[PDB]
Amino acid sequence: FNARRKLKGAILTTMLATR
Amino acid sequence: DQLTEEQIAEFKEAFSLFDKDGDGTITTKELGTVMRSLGQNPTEAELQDMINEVDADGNGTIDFPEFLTMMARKEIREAFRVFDKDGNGYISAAELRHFMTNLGEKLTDEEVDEMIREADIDGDGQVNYEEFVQMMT
Ligand SMILES: [Ca+2]
Ligand SMILES: [Ca+2]
Ligand SMILES: [Ca+2]
Ligand SMILES: [Ca+2]
């Protein structure tokens, strides 16, 4: 498990989805 | 300049949260569904334009090499507010767990805690805005 990948990947999705 | 393997794996994780059916491409409908679930309301024209701006080979969907091209070429506060559901300025483990299962993800308690610990700089066991910003910058 890569905690940084999972967290930053989810934050980058939120940033994209909220433009 | 460079792209590390860690940076590519993060872009790959992000791509996979949009690719809801796991078929290797993001459609307008998958984008629409994710954006609505995070509180946005794109029109059909906006969803089609967004896919078109990223769809470099023109087949009408986004694959990871196209997604990587856009992410390498490119509001952290508005994202922080998605995670900080009660708006008290601190992302708790419970809030992160909740945000992650609403994305359809399967996580253990230890896993959520490992993510809190990764972002937690001062060590109070929560993630404030400054720690959120430092994670992404
Ligand atoms: Ca798909
Ligand atoms: Ca394409
Ligand atoms: Ca909170
Ligand atoms: Ca903290």
Numbering used by the authors:
A (entry chain B): 293 to 311
B (entry chain A): 2 to 75, 84 to 146
Paper quotes:
Ca2+-bound calmodulin (Ca2+-CaM) has a dumbbell-like structure with two EF-hand containing globular domains connected by a flexible (helical) linker. Upon binding to target peptides, CaM typically wraps around the helical peptides, leading to a dramatic conformational change. In this study, we genetically incorporated the unnatural amino acid p-azido-phenylalanine (AzF) in different positions of CaM to exploit the azido stretching mode as a probe of local changes in the chemical environment of AzF in various CaM/CaMBD-complexes by IR-spectroscopy.
We further determined the crystal structure of AzF-labelled calmodulin in complex with a peptide from calmodulin-dependent protein kinase IIα, providing a structural explanation of the IR shifts observed upon binding. In order to investigate the structural basis for the significant alteration of the azido stretching vibration of AzF-labelled CaM when bound to peptide P2, we determined the crystal structure of this complex. Our crystallographic structure refinement shows that the introduced AzF side chain at position 108 points towards the P2 peptide as clearly shown in the electron density. The azido group is in para-position of AzF108 and interacts with the backbone carbonyl oxygen of Ala302 and the side chain carbonyl oxygen of Thr306 of the bound peptide via dipole-dipole interactions and shows a moderate solvent accessibility [Figs. 4(b) and 4(e)]. The introduction of the AzF label also leads to a conformational change in the Asn111 side chain (compared to the wild-type complex). The position of AzF in the complex structure would sterically clash with the position of Asn111 in the wild-type structure. We consider this particular structural motif to be responsible for the characteristically narrower lineshape of the azido stretching band.
